[PDB]
């Protein structure tokens, strides 16, 4: 009946080109040398605790425009400050991302390859906040396929210049991302040829903070959860990127369809509607639900019909997690709907104290004290649907922050 599609499927793509990207970057640059492998790995996990300060300025930016583009006020205050708030983030990440990220790598020239591939990143990353808020801006609007064609044309610019400068050594790896970074952004800087108070910018950081938060706490509490199952040899430690990147891809369903929500719950909030709102964001929870079921149900009776691309005993221990993470896809379709629709209404605290919660109590604590007792599927069984709970039955605080609402 509406049209939700519109604006989920675009973001999925650009989040398929995010991940087709990464991927290839593990190949453009494993060519020669496979010890550079470690400065691709050991950077992006720096670079996720580092890419933790984009809501920053990407929640601000993506909730205040969609809420106002539903009020049908002027978000050009709040696009000139989001790009400001990105660039003022971006001011100590220039300089003081250079040496933290040497330093932390006590997790002689194991980490001095990093040094020369992630340079060109650090020269541009004040370049690369500015389209992290374009990105909000453009998916706060509603114009989600803009946003994808640069996608686009930044994926295919990058796999030219990485390839080109790669096959320099590895800091042109880097350098293929700082170029196609910066070209996206003299894309979006030449459209706006085409298509502001201090309090605005102090509100931004009220809704970006909390946000902040989740996706930089949440890096403590993934380092954490892979460890525990070190203890369980190499056919399962392999088992984990087998079952990890055909999930990453599969949990991009949930990740547009929620930014597709924090602009429709964003909007509807901001237009006095809540027959608007409450229906979309149920309908998109059913729709999702019976859409992710498809594909978990997929990964369950098809288990090395797909783990067999990159595969016996991994083949066995692989299939242990499609089938069993395949039954919590029904409640990430009812938790990027729930988290991600209290984003747009102005309640980005509310999301920092679920996944937290989800997370810990439910998913490590009773992991540890059950695996420092039994197997790598009890972790994966309370890592599945046990905690996926939290994410289903937290729609009552969905339902009791409307309910009391009217």
């Known amino acids: 009946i ?88 971006s001011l100590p990440l220039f300089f003081y991302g250079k040496d933290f990220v040497l330093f932390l790598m006590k997790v002689e020239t194991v980490r001095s390859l990093a040094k020369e591939y992630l340079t060109p990143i650090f020269w541009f990353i004040p370049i690369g906040f500015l389209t992290n808020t374009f990105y909000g801006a453009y998916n706060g609007a509603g114009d989600t396929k803009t946003p994808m064609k640069v996608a686009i044309i930044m994926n295919l610019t990058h796999i030219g210049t990485a390839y080109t400068l790669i096959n320099l050594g590895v800091e042109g790896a880097g350098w293929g991302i700082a170029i196609s970074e910066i070209l996206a952004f003299f894309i979006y800087t030449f459209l706006l040829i085409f298509f502001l108070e201090p309090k605005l910018l102090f509100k931004m950081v009220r809704l970006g903070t909390p946000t902040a938060l989740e996706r930089a706490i ?108 395949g039954i919590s896809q029904p409640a990430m379709a009812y938790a990027s709907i729930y988290s991600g629709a209290l984003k747009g209404m102005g309640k980005t605290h509310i999301p920092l104290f679920v996944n937290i919660s989800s997370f810990w109590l439910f998913r490590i604590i009773p992991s540890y004290f059950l695996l420092k007792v039994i197997s790598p599927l009890v972790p994966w069984g309370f890592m599945t649907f046990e905690t996926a709970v939290r994410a289903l039955f937290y729609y009552t605080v969905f339902k009791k922050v409307v309910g009391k609402l009217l």
């Not at 149900?297 to 990159?310: D, Q």
Request: aromatic letters at 12%; glycine letters at 6%; zero cysteines.
């Open 2 to 89: 509406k049209k939700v599609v519109k604006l989920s499927i675009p973001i999925i793509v650009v989040n398929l080109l995010y991940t087709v990207e990464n991927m290839i970057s593990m190949i453009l640059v494993s060519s020669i040398s496979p010890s550079a492998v470690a400065a691709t790995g050991f950077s992006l996990s720096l670079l996720w605790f580092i890419y933790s300060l984009m809501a920053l300025s990407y929640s601000g930016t993506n909730i205040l425009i969609a809420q106002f583009v539903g009020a049908k006020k002027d978000p050009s205050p709040i696009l000139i400050n989001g790009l400001f708030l990105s660039f003022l983030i």
């Open 218 to 325: 949440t890096t403590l509490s993934f380092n954490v959860f892979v460890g525990f199952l070190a203890k369980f040899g190499d056919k399962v430690l392999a088992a984990h990127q087998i079952g990890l990147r055909i999930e990453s891809i599969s949990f991009m369903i949930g990740f547009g369809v929620m930014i597709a929500s924090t602009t429709l719950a964003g909007q509807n909030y901001g237009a006095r509607n809540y027959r608007g709102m409450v229906h979309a964001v149920n309908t998109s929870a059913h729709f999702t639900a019976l859409v992710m079921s498809l594909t978990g149900l997929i990964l369950i009776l098809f288990p090395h019909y797909l783990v067999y691309p990159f595969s016996p005993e991994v083949i066995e221990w692989a299939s242990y997690y499609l089938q069993i993470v």
